[PDB]
Amino acid sequence: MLVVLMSFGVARQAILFPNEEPSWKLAKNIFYMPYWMIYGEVFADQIDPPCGQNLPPCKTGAWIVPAIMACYLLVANILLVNLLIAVFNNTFFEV
Amino acid sequence: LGRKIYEFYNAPIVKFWFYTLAYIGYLMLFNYIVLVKMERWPSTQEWIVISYIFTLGIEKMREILMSEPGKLLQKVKVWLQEYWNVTDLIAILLFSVGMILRLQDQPFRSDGRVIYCVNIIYWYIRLLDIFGVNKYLGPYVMMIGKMMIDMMYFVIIMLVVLMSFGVARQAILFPNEEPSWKLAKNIFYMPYWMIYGEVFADQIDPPCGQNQLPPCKTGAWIVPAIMACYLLVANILLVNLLIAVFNNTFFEV
Amino acid sequence: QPFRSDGRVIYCVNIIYWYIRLLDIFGVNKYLGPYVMMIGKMMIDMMYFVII
Ligand SMILES: CC(C)CCC[C@@H](C)[C@H]1CC[C@H]2[C@@H]3CC=C4C[C@@H](OC(=O)CCC(=O)O)CC[C@]4(C)[C@H]3CC[C@]12C
Ligand SMILES: CC(C)CCC[C@@H](C)[C@H]1CC[C@H]2[C@@H]3CC=C4C[C@@H](OC(=O)CCC(=O)O)CC[C@]4(C)[C@H]3CC[C@]12C
Ligand SMILES: CC(C)CCC[C@@H](C)[C@H]1CC[C@H]2[C@@H]3CC=C4C[C@@H](OC(=O)CCC(=O)O)CC[C@]4(C)[C@H]3CC[C@]12C
Ligand SMILES: CC(C)CCC[C@@H](C)[C@H]1CC[C@H]2[C@@H]3CC=C4C[C@@H](OC(=O)CCC(=O)O)CC[C@]4(C)[C@H]3CC[C@]12C
Ligand SMILES: CC(C)CCC[C@@H](C)[C@H]1CC[C@H]2[C@@H]3CC=C4C[C@@H](OC(=O)CCC(=O)O)CC[C@]4(C)[C@H]3CC[C@]12C
Ligand SMILES: CC(C)CCC[C@@H](C)[C@H]1CC[C@H]2[C@@H]3CC=C4C[C@@H](OC(=O)CCC(=O)O)CC[C@]4(C)[C@H]3CC[C@]12C
Numbered sequence: 306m307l308v309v310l311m312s313f314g315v316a317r318q319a320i321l322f323p324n325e326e327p328s329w330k331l332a333k334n335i336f337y338m339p340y341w342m343i344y345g346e347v348f349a350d351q352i353d354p355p356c357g358q359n360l361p362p363c364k365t366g367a368w369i370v371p372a373i374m375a376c377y378l379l380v381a382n383i384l385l386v387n388l389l390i391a392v393f394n395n396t397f398f399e400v
Numbered sequence: 401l402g403r404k405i406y407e408f409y410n411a412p413i414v415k416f417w418f419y420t421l422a423y424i425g426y427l428m429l430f431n432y433i434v435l436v437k438m439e440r441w442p443s444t445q446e447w448i449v450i451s452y453i454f455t456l457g458i459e460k461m462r463e464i465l466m467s468e469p470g471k472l473l474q475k476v477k478v479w480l481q482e483y484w485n486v487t488d489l490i491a492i493l494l495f496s497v498g499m500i501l502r503l504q505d506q507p508f509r510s511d512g513r514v515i516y517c518v519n520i521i522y523w524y525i526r527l528l529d530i531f532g533v534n535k536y537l538g539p540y541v542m543m544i545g546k547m548m549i550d551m552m553y554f555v556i557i558m559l560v561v562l563m564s565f566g567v568a569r570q571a572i573l574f575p576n577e578e579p580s581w582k583l584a585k586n587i588f589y590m591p592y593w594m595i596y597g598e599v600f601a602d603q604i605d606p607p608c609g610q611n612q613l614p615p616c617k618t619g620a621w622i623v624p625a626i627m628a629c630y631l632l633v634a635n636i637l638l639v640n641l642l643i644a645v646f647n648n649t650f651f652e653v
Numbered sequence: 654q655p656f657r658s659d660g661r662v663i664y665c666v667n668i669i670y671w672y673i674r675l676l677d678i679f680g681v682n683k684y685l686g687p688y689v690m691m692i693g694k695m696m697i698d699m700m701y702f703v704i705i
Contacts, residue, residue: 312524319434319517323510331435345597353589365510373521378596379555384547387643388540391650553688556679564672571665575658619662626669636702641695645688 306343306385313377314339320370342374343381420530426452427523434520438513440505450499457492460485484529491522546653547646554642558595558634565591565630568623575617595634 314335325331338348353371356363408414426449433445442450467475479485498519502512528544531537566587577583590600605624608616679685 308524308527312521315431315434315520315524316517319520320514323513324437325435327432327436335435342596347593347596347598349593349598349600352593365514369514369518375592378593379551382596383554383639383642384544384551387646388543388547388650390643391647394647395651553685556685557676557688557692560672560675560679564669567668567672568665571668572662575661618658622662622666632699632703637692637696637699641692 306381309377309380309385310339310343311335313374316373317370320367321364323364339374339377342378343386347378416533423527423530427527430520430523434513434516438502438509440509442503450495453492453495453499456488457496460488460492484526487522487526491519495519543650543653546649550642550645550649554638554645558638561630561633561638562591562595563587565626568626572618572620572623591630594631595639599631 314337317339318331318334322334338351342348352374354360356367429445430449433443433449436443436445438446464475464479467478469475469478494515498512498515501508501515504512528541531541569591570583570587574586590603594600604627606616607613608620676689680689
């Protein structure tokens with residue numbers, strides 16, 4: 306999880322927020338909201354903010370963030386977690 | 401000294417621990433350079449990172465030329481068999497084009513910073529290859545590799561169902577829009593995040609026409625029911641099927 | 654109208670079914686074909702869950 310979770314966390318804090326002076330909040334914003342989306346809350350209002358409709362301007366071509374996060378939620382909440390399901394199941398009789 | 405330094409720095413475990421500690425160090429420096437503002441000339445950290453990328457490209461070229469076949473086309477086939485090698489080539493290439501875009505000036509700079517970010521993705525996933533020395537984690541990553549094929553199926557079936565609600569939610573709720581590409585964003589926007597939690601409780605069943613909301617369109621009472629059938633058929637019918645398919649397959653892998 | 658409006662609705666209920674008929678075309682594959690095979694067999698197990 307740490308490797309795939311970190312990947313999305315670094316990516317979302319670098320697309321959305323494009324210009325910040327170096328500070329320790331950045332690591333918190335990596336290890337924040339992505340971790341809490343493997344547990345049920347996708348942070349829906351944060352995701353696809355409305356933008357440039359007569360609001361602050363569009364950060365970059367920030368269309369990467371919903372797509373790679375969709376890939377992340379598939380990878381995290383389905384494959385890995387289901388792997389732990391299977392791993393626990395087959396080691397269970399063994400122990 | 402000479403023999404102990406040369407013996408020790410040529411033991412393959414030691415040179416492994418070089419290459420992985422240097423690769424973790426690169427990951428930390430590239431983390432810093434992607435989560436900081438970047439001025440027009442590169443910073444020191446970025447110079448170390450781009451040095452890593454181009455020296456890695458030189459070493460890839462070294463072992464392509466130093467491969468065992470004598471014909472050059474033979475050795476480029478030898479290198480294009482193995483999977484992680486070709487993903488190295490495409491990613492070192494895409495970091496190179498990020499560098500050439502970001503040495504320029506706006507509007508190309510913001511695009512180049514995005515290109516750096518989509519490199520951050522892959523250079524994270526290469527740690528899965530790096531974690532192949534462990535006798536305990538090597539099998540897990542091989543398992544993931546076997547479970548991905550089963551995912552290809554689930555995903556396909558899901559698409560059919562998601563899209564089916566997606567079309568129906570798009571037409572029945574929204575009645576009189578004009579030809580636009582937002583229909584596709586809405587087709588895969590609202591009925592996709594529902595399989596992981598958020599059911600969009602306000603967005604579903606708004607009260608219509610009472611102090612006033614616009615009088616609710618056509619026969620839009622049907623969208624909660626086909627929504628209900630969708631949530632059952634996705635979250636219980638398939639996901640659970642995928643649990644079963646992983647358990648059967650995992651045993652053999 | 655207003656039948657027009659209701660004529661729009663029951664077109665849209667149809668594309669629910671005509672999407673699900675693409676599962677038939679997925680049946681011909683050597684591997685997707687067996688996966689839709691198990692879906693119908695699990696659906697009788699869910700019918701017992703939907704009552705409970
Ligand atoms: C993926 C994880 C494990 C590592 C991620 C690394 C970064 C998120 C860290 C590593 C070095 C850190 C920096 C080290 C020292 C400082 C100095 C510190 O400066 C001050 O407090 C005041 C400075 C001034 O105004 O002179 C601000 C935080 C900062 C930039 C830190 C911000 C967070 C950084 C970039
Ligand atoms: C490897 C796994 C198993 C554990 C990794 C733990 C770290 C990722 C955590 C533990 C301590 C955390 C830090 C604890 C306190 C702070 C200070 C906090 O900075 C401030 O409150 C000052 C700046 C400001 O308030 O603006 C920023 C988050 C940070 C660096 C945290 C970032 C994330 C850290 C390094
Ligand atoms: C089903 C699986 C494959 C997931 C599919 C997800 C993507 C195809 C969707 C999900 C959310 C969508 C985004 C949601 C909203 C917007 C905002 C929209 O922004 C603007 O029009 C900006 C206007 C301006 O320039 O100010 C651009 C499309 C975009 C990024 C969408 C692009 C397509 C996305 C990433
Ligand atoms: C179910 C999935 C897999 C496919 C769904 C298909 C549609 C969502 C796409 C396919 C073709 C698209 C169309 C292709 C080109 C155009 C032209 C475009 O025209 C303009 O922007 C200018 C119009 C003008 O003022 O003349 C309007 C969107 C539209 C109709 C697109 C709307 C979205 C469409 C219908
Ligand atoms: C088969 C699965 C695994 C992937 C399918 C991917 C596509 C169905 C996605 C990926 C890219 C998406 C597009 C990315 C960007 C846009 C532009 C966006 O249009 C605008 O922002 C301009 C109009 C406006 O904002 O007013 C509308 C959604 C659309 C066509 C998205 C529609 C859905 C697309 C084609
Ligand atoms: C047992 C499992 C498989 C499904 C259980 C849930 C359904 C029985 C519920 C959930 C949502 C409900 C629907 C939510 C909203 C409406 C709109 C409602 O229309 C109005 O209220 C009129 C317009 C207005 O004034 O709002 C008619 C009932 C209906 C279709 C409800 C019928 C019963 C539904 C489908």
